[PDB]
Scaffold this active site. Sequence first.
Site, PDB file in Angstrom:
ATOM      1  N   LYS A   1       0.734  -1.233   0.069  1.00 32.20           N
ATOM      2  CA  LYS A   1       0.055   0.025   0.060  1.00 32.20           C
ATOM      3  C   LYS A   1       0.919   1.331   0.208  1.00 32.20           C
ATOM      4  O   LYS A   1       1.951   1.452   0.704  1.00 32.20           O
ATOM      5  CB  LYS A   1      -0.820  -0.170   1.094  1.00 32.20           C
ATOM      6  CG  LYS A   1      -2.007   1.222   1.466  1.00 32.20           C
ATOM      7  CD  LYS A   1      -2.800   1.099   2.493  1.00 32.20           C
ATOM      8  CE  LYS A   1      -3.543   2.303   2.868  1.00 32.20           C
ATOM      9  NZ  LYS A   1      -4.201   2.320   4.021  1.00 32.20           N
TER      10      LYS A   1
ATOM     11  N   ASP B   1       0.740   2.543   4.977  1.00 36.84           N
ATOM     12  CA  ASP B   1       0.625   2.023   6.379  1.00 36.84           C
ATOM     13  C   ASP B   1       0.014   0.763   6.484  1.00 36.84           C
ATOM     14  O   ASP B   1      -0.603   0.227   7.577  1.00 36.84           O
ATOM     15  CB  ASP B   1      -0.453   3.086   7.114  1.00 36.84           C
ATOM     16  CG  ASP B   1      -1.639   3.179   6.679  1.00 36.84           C
ATOM     17  OD1 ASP B   1      -2.193   3.150   5.356  1.00 36.84           O
ATOM     18  OD2 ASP B   1      -2.521   2.963   7.482  1.00 36.84           O
ATOM     19  N   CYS B   2       0.261  -0.132   5.579  1.00 35.16           N
ATOM     20  CA  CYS B   2      -0.351  -1.683   5.959  1.00 35.16           C
ATOM     21  C   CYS B   2       0.526  -2.408   6.626  1.00 35.16           C
ATOM     22  O   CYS B   2       1.646  -2.768   5.930  1.00 35.16           O
ATOM     23  CB  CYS B   2      -0.633  -2.335   4.351  1.00 35.16           C
ATOM     24  SG  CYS B   2      -1.484  -3.323   4.185  1.00 35.16           S
TER      25      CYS B   2
ATOM     26  N   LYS C   1      -5.870   2.366  -8.755  1.00 34.29           N
ATOM     27  CA  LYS C   1      -5.282   1.153  -8.962  1.00 34.29           C
ATOM     28  C   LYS C   1      -4.835   1.029 -10.308  1.00 34.29           C
ATOM     29  O   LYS C   1      -5.703   0.496 -10.889  1.00 34.29           O
ATOM     30  CB  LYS C   1      -6.105  -0.143  -8.376  1.00 34.29           C
ATOM     31  CG  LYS C   1      -6.592   0.459  -6.940  1.00 34.29           C
ATOM     32  CD  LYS C   1      -6.576  -0.928  -5.721  1.00 34.29           C
ATOM     33  CE  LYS C   1      -7.496  -1.851  -6.188  1.00 34.29           C
ATOM     34  NZ  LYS C   1      -8.628  -1.918  -5.312  1.00 34.29           N
TER      35      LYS C   1
ATOM     36  N   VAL D   1      -3.588  -5.794  -1.487  1.00 30.83           N
ATOM     37  CA  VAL D   1      -2.055  -6.027  -0.987  1.00 30.83           C
ATOM     38  C   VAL D   1      -2.017  -6.481   0.259  1.00 30.83           C
ATOM     39  O   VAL D   1      -2.975  -6.592   1.133  1.00 30.83           O
ATOM     40  CB  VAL D   1      -1.315  -4.455  -1.097  1.00 30.83           C
ATOM     41  CG1 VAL D   1      -1.003  -4.307  -2.592  1.00 30.83           C
ATOM     42  CG2 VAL D   1      -2.136  -3.448  -0.336  1.00 30.83           C
TER      43      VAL D   1
ATOM     44  N   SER E   1      -0.653 -12.363   3.396  1.00 25.84           N
ATOM     45  CA  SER E   1       0.621 -12.085   4.116  1.00 25.84           C
ATOM     46  C   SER E   1       1.205 -13.351   4.895  1.00 25.84           C
ATOM     47  O   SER E   1       2.411 -13.588   5.088  1.00 25.84           O
ATOM     48  CB  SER E   1       0.546 -10.987   5.167  1.00 25.84           C
ATOM     49  OG  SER E   1      -0.153 -11.077   6.225  1.00 25.84           O
TER      50      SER E   1
ATOM     51  N   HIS F   1       1.446   0.703  14.840  1.00 23.85           N
ATOM     52  CA  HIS F   1      -0.146   1.043  14.698  1.00 23.85           C
ATOM     53  C   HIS F   1      -0.821   1.588  15.964  1.00 23.85           C
ATOM     54  O   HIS F   1      -1.314   2.775  16.023  1.00 23.85           O
ATOM     55  CB  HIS F   1      -0.939   0.299  13.829  1.00 23.85           C
ATOM     56  CG  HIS F   1      -0.590   0.375  12.186  1.00 23.85           C
ATOM     57  ND1 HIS F   1      -1.668   0.986  11.308  1.00 23.85           N
ATOM     58  CD2 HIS F   1       0.423   0.265  11.561  1.00 23.85           C
ATOM     59  CE1 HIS F   1      -1.270   0.920  10.230  1.00 23.85           C
ATOM     60  NE2 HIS F   1       0.168   0.523  10.206  1.00 23.85           N
TER      61      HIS F   1
ATOM     62  N   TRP G   1      -5.352   6.158   8.853  1.00 26.38           N
ATOM     63  CA  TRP G   1      -6.521   5.650   9.903  1.00 26.38           C
ATOM     64  C   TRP G   1      -7.516   6.929   9.617  1.00 26.38           C
ATOM     65  O   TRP G   1      -8.554   6.547  10.206  1.00 26.38           O
ATOM     66  CB  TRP G   1      -5.848   5.451  11.300  1.00 26.38           C
ATOM     67  CG  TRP G   1      -5.681   4.056  11.759  1.00 26.38           C
ATOM     68  CD1 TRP G   1      -4.297   3.532  11.548  1.00 26.38           C
ATOM     69  CD2 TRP G   1      -6.514   3.047  11.913  1.00 26.38           C
ATOM     70  NE1 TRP G   1      -4.508   2.171  11.812  1.00 26.38           N
ATOM     71  CE2 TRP G   1      -5.839   1.892  12.087  1.00 26.38           C
ATOM     72  CE3 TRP G   1      -8.096   2.801  11.857  1.00 26.38           C
ATOM     73  CZ2 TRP G   1      -6.418   0.568  12.360  1.00 26.38           C
ATOM     74  CZ3 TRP G   1      -8.526   1.508  12.231  1.00 26.38           C
ATOM     75  CH2 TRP G   1      -7.734   0.408  12.211  1.00 26.38           C
TER      76      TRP G   1
ATOM     77  N   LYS H   1     -11.041   6.259   8.563  1.00 26.10           N
ATOM     78  CA  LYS H   1     -11.506   5.162   9.072  1.00 26.10           C
ATOM     79  C   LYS H   1     -11.844   5.058  10.468  1.00 26.10           C
ATOM     80  O   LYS H   1     -12.738   4.391  11.053  1.00 26.10           O
ATOM     81  CB  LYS H   1     -10.573   3.716   8.974  1.00 26.10           C
ATOM     82  CG  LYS H   1     -10.104   3.512   7.562  1.00 26.10           C
ATOM     83  CD  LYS H   1      -9.160   2.489   7.428  1.00 26.10           C
ATOM     84  CE  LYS H   1      -8.648   2.548   6.042  1.00 26.10           C
ATOM     85  NZ  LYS H   1      -8.009   1.162   5.703  1.00 26.10           N
TER      86      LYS H   1
END
Length: 212
Positions: A7, A18-19, A46, A59, A72, A159, A206, A209
């Site tokens: 990301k 920040d992924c 994208k 991702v 992941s 995070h 963030w 969200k």
Amino acid sequence: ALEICVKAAVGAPDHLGDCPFSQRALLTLEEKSLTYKIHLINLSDKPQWFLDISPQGKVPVLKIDDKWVTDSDVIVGILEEKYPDPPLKTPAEFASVGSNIFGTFGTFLKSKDSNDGSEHALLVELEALENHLKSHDGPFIAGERVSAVDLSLAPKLYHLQVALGHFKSWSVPESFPHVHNYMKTLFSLDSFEKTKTEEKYVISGWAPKVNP
């Protein structure tokens, strides 16, 4: 070569975003001292080449052999099998240490209702990590050397620190000194320093969200 899509930062698609799952994969590439290309992907705009190789457009994605691989967990286990040294296997008994911290942190971060019990639920997960750390040899969850669980957990704890700090002026209480010490150990890893998201971009990530 090994290539990986991750990301890009919200509001700054030329910088690493920040992924935490992407960062887990980066951390693993680094701890294995492997060579790889990074493709920063803007999730709101994208590119087409990227969708032709990641159906859901999610991702992280890792190119290994001539296959593009998502998820992941899968990504880091393929890397462990293909490049076994230095090993990063975590003993199974400790592989789930800390696994609910990220979820309870998200719920607490999002709460605006001071009595929904969300703080307490996070505190119980921190408590459990504290109890592990204080009763097992460190500095890492499984002892002397960093392993898979530490690399999954480090991005999530970062995070938590950065986001709860910025959005709520809230810190892990002083009464979890092992958790504080463990977080310092993780954030001063060379791999962590090399792959970390600037704090700016955890905040920008963030911000949209925190409130639906």
